[PDB]
Amino acid sequence: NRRVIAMPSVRKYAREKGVDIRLVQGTGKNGRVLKEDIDAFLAGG
Numbered sequence: 088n089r090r091v092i093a094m095p096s097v098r099k100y101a102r103e104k105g106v107d108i109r110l111v112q113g114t115g116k117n118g119r120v121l122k123e124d125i126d127a128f129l130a131g132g
Contacts, residue, residue, distance in 0.1 A: 093111075097121055097124070097125055104129060106125060106129055110128075111127075111128040
């Protein structure tokens with residue numbers, strides 16, 4: 088197995104944008120992928 092440190096909202100996010108939290112830049116407590124983390128993943132440059 089391999090549980091991810093994301094929230095029910097962040098999941099919908101990656102599901103609505105097409106991103107995979109599993110590989111997002113989780114900066115939250117204990118590497119927690121938050122909304123800002125999702126935007127950061129898709130953003131950059």
